[PDB]
Structure formats: structure tokens, C-alpha cells
Amino acid sequence: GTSKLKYVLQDARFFLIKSNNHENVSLAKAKGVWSTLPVNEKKLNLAFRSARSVILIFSVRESGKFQGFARLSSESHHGGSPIHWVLPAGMSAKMLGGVFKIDWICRRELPFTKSAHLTNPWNEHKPVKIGRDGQEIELECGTQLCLLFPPDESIDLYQVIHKM
């Protein structure tokens, strides 16, 4: 192991990402991209310039779990291959903001039952599983949450350390 992981998380910022469906998280896992609404896009872009690592922790609504976490490797950008998200009905892809490139750090799941002892001071100390899409997670909460995930032996953090 967890040492390179701890190095990546040192002084990171953490954001809760809530997805309405598994297909979008699977797309993000396969393509290494994420997109969010502009209010969250601006917060993530500000954070990306401000911190060594900005970590997105993903949870699909009604799943009762986190599905993994990833590190921003770029600010948002527009143009390029349109990502075929499953949009929330109404659902203009034009309503989305730009595309963030992300490097996955752990693609394994963690059930909420394992994070019930972690509260997020930036969301009224509610359990860290609770929060709107884009909710920032305080440093210590976010670090301990990431350390709870089962190690993902498929990922080599040597590559993402060099991007810091």
C-alpha cells in the first residue's frame, strides 16, 4: 503493498461521484474517461490545478457499494470521439461538460457496510457513502476510504506517480 498508493493519496483531494447506472462506470473503466455536469466540471478543474492528485471515488446508486476510484490525469476538454453514456432521460449530451481523462487506481468494489465508520466533515459528518454527485470528501476521510478498498493487483502505480 500500500506504500505507492499512500504516496499517490498524499495531500490529494477527493470527490464522491454518483452514477445512476453501471454502464457509465463500466464505460469509464474501459475508456479511462469521465464527464459530469458543468457545476461539478468547474470544481474538478479548479481542484486539478490545486492539488498533486484529484481522486474520484465512484458509487452506482442503489448498488450499496463503491465501484472503485481513479485519479484525474487532465482537466476537462471538448471534442473527440463522443462517449455513448446512458444519459438520465431528457438527457442531452450537450448538457454535459467536457471530458476528463482518468487513470484508475482500483477497479474493485467496496460495500458501504465496510465504510460505515467513516464520516465526511464536509457533508455534515454524514457517512461518506451519503452525498450528492460531486460532493468533496475531506482529506482524512477520503484517504481512509481509499485504503479500505481491496488492493487491485492489476494496476501498476509506477505510471501514475510519474504524472504527479
Side-chain angles (χ1 to χ4, degrees), residues 50-61 63-72:
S50 91
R52 301 252 289 164
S53 296
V54 178
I55 302 298
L56 306 192
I57 310 171
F58 289 82
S59 170
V60 176
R61 289 227 150 80
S63 67
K65 303 166 189 174
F66 304 96
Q67 279 68 42
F69 56 99
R71 178 192 177 275
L72 293 190

PDB file of all heavy atoms in Angstrom, residues 50-72, unseen atoms left out:
ATOM      1  N   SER A  50      -4.996  22.609  -8.340  1.00  0.00           N
ATOM      2  CA  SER A  50      -4.669  22.964  -6.969  1.00  0.00           C
ATOM      3  C   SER A  50      -3.953  21.869  -6.194  1.00  0.00           C
ATOM      4  O   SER A  50      -3.384  22.162  -5.139  1.00  0.00           O
ATOM      5  CB  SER A  50      -5.947  23.334  -6.210  1.00  0.00           C
ATOM      6  OG  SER A  50      -6.494  22.184  -5.585  1.00  0.00           O
ATOM      7  N   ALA A  51      -3.979  20.621  -6.660  1.00  0.00           N
ATOM      8  CA  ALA A  51      -3.515  19.521  -5.830  1.00  0.00           C
ATOM      9  C   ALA A  51      -2.701  18.541  -6.661  1.00  0.00           C
ATOM     10  O   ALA A  51      -2.893  18.423  -7.872  1.00  0.00           O
ATOM     11  CB  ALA A  51      -4.695  18.794  -5.153  1.00  0.00           C
ATOM     12  N   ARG A  52      -1.791  17.839  -5.980  1.00  0.00           N
ATOM     13  CA  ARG A  52      -0.971  16.822  -6.633  1.00  0.00           C
ATOM     14  C   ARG A  52      -1.822  15.739  -7.290  1.00  0.00           C
ATOM     15  O   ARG A  52      -1.483  15.247  -8.373  1.00  0.00           O
ATOM     16  CB  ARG A  52      -0.016  16.193  -5.617  1.00  0.00           C
ATOM     17  CG  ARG A  52       0.928  17.174  -4.938  1.00  0.00           C
ATOM     18  CD  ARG A  52       2.354  17.001  -5.453  1.00  0.00           C
ATOM     19  NE  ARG A  52       2.967  15.756  -4.989  1.00  0.00           N
ATOM     20  CZ  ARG A  52       4.059  15.220  -5.527  1.00  0.00           C
ATOM     21  NH1 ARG A  52       4.652  15.824  -6.544  1.00  0.00           N
ATOM     22  NH2 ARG A  52       4.558  14.085  -5.050  1.00  0.00           N
ATOM     23  N   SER A  53      -2.911  15.329  -6.638  1.00  0.00           N
ATOM     24  CA  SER A  53      -3.807  14.300  -7.158  1.00  0.00           C
ATOM     25  C   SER A  53      -5.237  14.678  -6.812  1.00  0.00           C
ATOM     26  O   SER A  53      -5.512  15.061  -5.674  1.00  0.00           O
ATOM     27  CB  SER A  53      -3.506  12.917  -6.561  1.00  0.00           C
ATOM     28  OG  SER A  53      -2.213  12.447  -6.932  1.00  0.00           O
ATOM     29  N   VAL A  54      -6.140  14.555  -7.780  1.00  0.00           N
ATOM     30  CA  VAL A  54      -7.576  14.667  -7.535  1.00  0.00           C
ATOM     31  C   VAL A  54      -8.178  13.290  -7.784  1.00  0.00           C
ATOM     32  O   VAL A  54      -8.071  12.754  -8.895  1.00  0.00           O
ATOM     33  CB  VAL A  54      -8.235  15.728  -8.428  1.00  0.00           C
ATOM     34  CG1 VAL A  54      -9.741  15.777  -8.159  1.00  0.00           C
ATOM     35  CG2 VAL A  54      -7.613  17.099  -8.170  1.00  0.00           C
ATOM     36  N   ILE A  55      -8.811  12.722  -6.753  1.00  0.00           N
ATOM     37  CA  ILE A  55      -9.283  11.340  -6.750  1.00  0.00           C
ATOM     38  C   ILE A  55     -10.802  11.347  -6.844  1.00  0.00           C
ATOM     39  O   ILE A  55     -11.470  12.034  -6.063  1.00  0.00           O
ATOM     40  CB  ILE A  55      -8.838  10.595  -5.477  1.00  0.00           C
ATOM     41  CG1 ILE A  55      -7.314  10.590  -5.327  1.00  0.00           C
ATOM     42  CG2 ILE A  55      -9.455   9.191  -5.407  1.00  0.00           C
ATOM     43  CD1 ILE A  55      -6.590   9.884  -6.443  1.00  0.00           C
ATOM     44  N   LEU A  56     -11.342  10.600  -7.801  1.00  0.00           N
ATOM     45  CA  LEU A  56     -12.778  10.392  -7.928  1.00  0.00           C
ATOM     46  C   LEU A  56     -13.112   9.009  -7.388  1.00  0.00           C
ATOM     47  O   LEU A  56     -12.531   8.014  -7.830  1.00  0.00           O
ATOM     48  CB  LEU A  56     -13.240  10.490  -9.384  1.00  0.00           C
ATOM     49  CG  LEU A  56     -12.920  11.714 -10.241  1.00  0.00           C
ATOM     50  CD1 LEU A  56     -13.734  11.670 -11.508  1.00  0.00           C
ATOM     51  CD2 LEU A  56     -13.207  12.997  -9.486  1.00  0.00           C
ATOM     52  N   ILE A  57     -14.039   8.945  -6.438  1.00  0.00           N
ATOM     53  CA  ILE A  57     -14.499   7.688  -5.853  1.00  0.00           C
ATOM     54  C   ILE A  57     -15.928   7.445  -6.333  1.00  0.00           C
ATOM     55  O   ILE A  57     -16.826   8.255  -6.067  1.00  0.00           O
ATOM     56  CB  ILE A  57     -14.417   7.729  -4.321  1.00  0.00           C
ATOM     57  CG1 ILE A  57     -13.028   8.222  -3.884  1.00  0.00           C
ATOM     58  CG2 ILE A  57     -14.733   6.355  -3.719  1.00  0.00           C
ATOM     59  CD1 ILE A  57     -12.931   8.488  -2.402  1.00  0.00           C
ATOM     60  N   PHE A  58     -16.148   6.319  -7.024  1.00  0.00           N
ATOM     61  CA  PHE A  58     -17.376   6.083  -7.777  1.00  0.00           C
ATOM     62  C   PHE A  58     -18.351   5.215  -6.998  1.00  0.00           C
ATOM     63  O   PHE A  58     -17.951   4.207  -6.407  1.00  0.00           O
ATOM     64  CB  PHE A  58     -17.056   5.374  -9.096  1.00  0.00           C
ATOM     65  CG  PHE A  58     -16.365   6.241 -10.092  1.00  0.00           C
ATOM     66  CD1 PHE A  58     -14.986   6.442 -10.031  1.00  0.00           C
ATOM     67  CD2 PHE A  58     -17.088   6.892 -11.074  1.00  0.00           C
ATOM     68  CE1 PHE A  58     -14.348   7.273 -10.946  1.00  0.00           C
ATOM     69  CE2 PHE A  58     -16.451   7.712 -11.994  1.00  0.00           C
ATOM     70  CZ  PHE A  58     -15.077   7.900 -11.930  1.00  0.00           C
ATOM     71  N   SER A  59     -19.643   5.574  -7.038  1.00  0.00           N
ATOM     72  CA  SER A  59     -20.668   4.695  -6.495  1.00  0.00           C
ATOM     73  C   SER A  59     -21.907   4.745  -7.382  1.00  0.00           C
ATOM     74  O   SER A  59     -22.390   5.827  -7.730  1.00  0.00           O
ATOM     75  CB  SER A  59     -21.019   5.070  -5.049  1.00  0.00           C
ATOM     76  OG  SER A  59     -22.169   4.363  -4.616  1.00  0.00           O
ATOM     77  N   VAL A  60     -22.391   3.572  -7.779  1.00  0.00           N
ATOM     78  CA  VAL A  60     -23.623   3.455  -8.553  1.00  0.00           C
ATOM     79  C   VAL A  60     -24.809   3.474  -7.596  1.00  0.00           C
ATOM     80  O   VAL A  60     -24.847   2.706  -6.625  1.00  0.00           O
ATOM     81  CB  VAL A  60     -23.622   2.171  -9.397  1.00  0.00           C
ATOM     82  CG1 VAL A  60     -24.952   2.023 -10.110  1.00  0.00           C
ATOM     83  CG2 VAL A  60     -22.477   2.189 -10.402  1.00  0.00           C
ATOM     84  N   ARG A  61     -25.775   4.351  -7.870  1.00  0.00           N
ATOM     85  CA  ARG A  61     -26.939   4.468  -6.999  1.00  0.00           C
ATOM     86  C   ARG A  61     -27.662   3.134  -6.912  1.00  0.00           C
ATOM     87  O   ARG A  61     -27.764   2.403  -7.898  1.00  0.00           O
ATOM     88  CB  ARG A  61     -27.892   5.549  -7.511  1.00  0.00           C
ATOM     89  CG  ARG A  61     -27.374   6.975  -7.346  1.00  0.00           C
ATOM     90  CD  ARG A  61     -28.444   7.889  -6.760  1.00  0.00           C
ATOM     91  NE  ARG A  61     -27.878   8.977  -5.964  1.00  0.00           N
ATOM     92  CZ  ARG A  61     -27.373  10.092  -6.481  1.00  0.00           C
ATOM     93  NH1 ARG A  61     -27.354  10.260  -7.799  1.00  0.00           N
ATOM     94  NH2 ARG A  61     -26.882  11.037  -5.685  1.00  0.00           N
ATOM     95  N   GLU A  62     -28.137   2.811  -5.710  1.00  0.00           N
ATOM     96  CA  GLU A  62     -28.864   1.590  -5.372  1.00  0.00           C
ATOM     97  C   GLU A  62     -27.977   0.352  -5.370  1.00  0.00           C
ATOM     98  O   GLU A  62     -28.474  -0.748  -5.100  1.00  0.00           O
ATOM     99  CB  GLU A  62     -30.061   1.340  -6.304  1.00  0.00           C
ATOM    100  CG  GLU A  62     -31.084   2.464  -6.309  1.00  0.00           C
ATOM    101  N   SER A  63     -26.679   0.479  -5.656  1.00  0.00           N
ATOM    102  CA  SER A  63     -25.834  -0.705  -5.634  1.00  0.00           C
ATOM    103  C   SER A  63     -25.389  -1.073  -4.231  1.00  0.00           C
ATOM    104  O   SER A  63     -25.051  -2.235  -3.993  1.00  0.00           O
ATOM    105  CB  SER A  63     -24.595  -0.499  -6.508  1.00  0.00           C
ATOM    106  OG  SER A  63     -23.761   0.503  -5.936  1.00  0.00           O
ATOM    107  N   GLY A  64     -25.378  -0.110  -3.305  1.00  0.00           N
ATOM    108  CA  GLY A  64     -24.867  -0.351  -1.969  1.00  0.00           C
ATOM    109  C   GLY A  64     -23.364  -0.467  -1.876  1.00  0.00           C
ATOM    110  O   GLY A  64     -22.846  -0.964  -0.867  1.00  0.00           O
ATOM    111  N   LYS A  65     -22.647  -0.056  -2.921  1.00  0.00           N
ATOM    112  CA  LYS A  65     -21.204  -0.205  -2.981  1.00  0.00           C
ATOM    113  C   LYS A  65     -20.578   0.981  -3.698  1.00  0.00           C
ATOM    114  O   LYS A  65     -21.225   1.695  -4.467  1.00  0.00           O
ATOM    115  CB  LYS A  65     -20.783  -1.494  -3.718  1.00  0.00           C
ATOM    116  CG  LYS A  65     -21.352  -2.783  -3.127  1.00  0.00           C
ATOM    117  CD  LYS A  65     -21.179  -3.938  -4.094  1.00  0.00           C
ATOM    118  CE  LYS A  65     -21.924  -5.168  -3.625  1.00  0.00           C
ATOM    119  NZ  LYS A  65     -21.864  -6.225  -4.658  1.00  0.00           N
ATOM    120  N   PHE A  66     -19.294   1.164  -3.431  1.00  0.00           N
ATOM    121  CA  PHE A  66     -18.393   1.878  -4.320  1.00  0.00           C
ATOM    122  C   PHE A  66     -17.850   0.907  -5.360  1.00  0.00           C
ATOM    123  O   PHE A  66     -17.626  -0.268  -5.065  1.00  0.00           O
ATOM    124  CB  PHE A  66     -17.231   2.483  -3.535  1.00  0.00           C
ATOM    125  CG  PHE A  66     -17.659   3.389  -2.413  1.00  0.00           C
ATOM    126  CD1 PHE A  66     -17.756   2.912  -1.121  1.00  0.00           C
ATOM    127  CD2 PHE A  66     -17.940   4.725  -2.660  1.00  0.00           C
ATOM    128  CE1 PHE A  66     -18.154   3.749  -0.087  1.00  0.00           C
ATOM    129  CE2 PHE A  66     -18.338   5.560  -1.634  1.00  0.00           C
ATOM    130  CZ  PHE A  66     -18.434   5.078  -0.351  1.00  0.00           C
ATOM    131  N   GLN A  67     -17.638   1.399  -6.578  1.00  0.00           N
ATOM    132  CA  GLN A  67     -17.119   0.547  -7.649  1.00  0.00           C
ATOM    133  C   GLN A  67     -15.638   0.754  -7.944  1.00  0.00           C
ATOM    134  O   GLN A  67     -15.107   0.082  -8.838  1.00  0.00           O
ATOM    135  CB  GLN A  67     -17.918   0.758  -8.938  1.00  0.00           C
ATOM    136  CG  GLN A  67     -19.236   0.006  -8.986  1.00  0.00           C
ATOM    137  CD  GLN A  67     -20.252   0.545  -7.979  1.00  0.00           C
ATOM    138  OE1 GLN A  67     -20.385   1.756  -7.816  1.00  0.00           O
ATOM    139  NE2 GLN A  67     -20.959  -0.351  -7.304  1.00  0.00           N
ATOM    140  N   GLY A  68     -14.957   1.650  -7.235  1.00  0.00           N
ATOM    141  CA  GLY A  68     -13.532   1.849  -7.407  1.00  0.00           C
ATOM    142  C   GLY A  68     -13.179   3.318  -7.316  1.00  0.00           C
ATOM    143  O   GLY A  68     -14.023   4.152  -6.991  1.00  0.00           O
ATOM    144  N   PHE A  69     -11.915   3.647  -7.584  1.00  0.00           N
ATOM    145  CA  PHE A  69     -11.548   5.057  -7.635  1.00  0.00           C
ATOM    146  C   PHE A  69     -10.432   5.288  -8.648  1.00  0.00           C
ATOM    147  O   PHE A  69      -9.689   4.371  -9.018  1.00  0.00           O
ATOM    148  CB  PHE A  69     -11.186   5.620  -6.242  1.00  0.00           C
ATOM    149  CG  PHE A  69     -10.091   4.889  -5.516  1.00  0.00           C
ATOM    150  CD1 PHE A  69      -8.792   5.385  -5.532  1.00  0.00           C
ATOM    151  CD2 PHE A  69     -10.360   3.748  -4.770  1.00  0.00           C
ATOM    152  CE1 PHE A  69      -7.777   4.754  -4.850  1.00  0.00           C
ATOM    153  CE2 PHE A  69      -9.347   3.105  -4.090  1.00  0.00           C
ATOM    154  CZ  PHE A  69      -8.050   3.615  -4.126  1.00  0.00           C
ATOM    155  N   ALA A  70     -10.357   6.536  -9.122  1.00  0.00           N
ATOM    156  CA  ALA A  70      -9.468   6.920 -10.212  1.00  0.00           C
ATOM    157  C   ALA A  70      -8.906   8.309  -9.943  1.00  0.00           C
ATOM    158  O   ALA A  70      -9.471   9.091  -9.177  1.00  0.00           O
ATOM    159  CB  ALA A  70     -10.196   6.912 -11.559  1.00  0.00           C
ATOM    160  N   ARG A  71      -7.803   8.627 -10.611  1.00  0.00           N
ATOM    161  CA  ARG A  71      -7.128   9.903 -10.443  1.00  0.00           C
ATOM    162  C   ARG A  71      -7.253  10.695 -11.735  1.00  0.00           C
ATOM    163  O   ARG A  71      -6.995  10.159 -12.819  1.00  0.00           O
ATOM    164  CB  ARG A  71      -5.659   9.690 -10.073  1.00  0.00           C
ATOM    165  CG  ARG A  71      -4.855  10.953  -9.911  1.00  0.00           C
ATOM    166  CD  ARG A  71      -3.360  10.627  -9.841  1.00  0.00           C
ATOM    167  NE  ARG A  71      -2.561  11.839  -9.745  1.00  0.00           N
ATOM    168  CZ  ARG A  71      -2.164  12.562 -10.788  1.00  0.00           C
ATOM    169  NH1 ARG A  71      -2.476  12.187 -12.024  1.00  0.00           N
ATOM    170  NH2 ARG A  71      -1.450  13.666 -10.593  1.00  0.00           N
ATOM    171  N   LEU A  72      -7.673  11.954 -11.625  1.00  0.00           N
ATOM    172  CA  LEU A  72      -7.686  12.837 -12.787  1.00  0.00           C
ATOM    173  C   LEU A  72      -6.282  12.961 -13.374  1.00  0.00           C
ATOM    174  O   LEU A  72      -5.320  13.236 -12.654  1.00  0.00           O
ATOM    175  CB  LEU A  72      -8.195  14.229 -12.396  1.00  0.00           C
ATOM    176  CG  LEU A  72      -9.648  14.431 -11.958  1.00  0.00           C
ATOM    177  CD1 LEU A  72     -10.002  15.918 -11.857  1.00  0.00           C
ATOM    178  CD2 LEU A  72     -10.625  13.713 -12.876  1.00  0.00           C
TER     179      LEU A  72
END
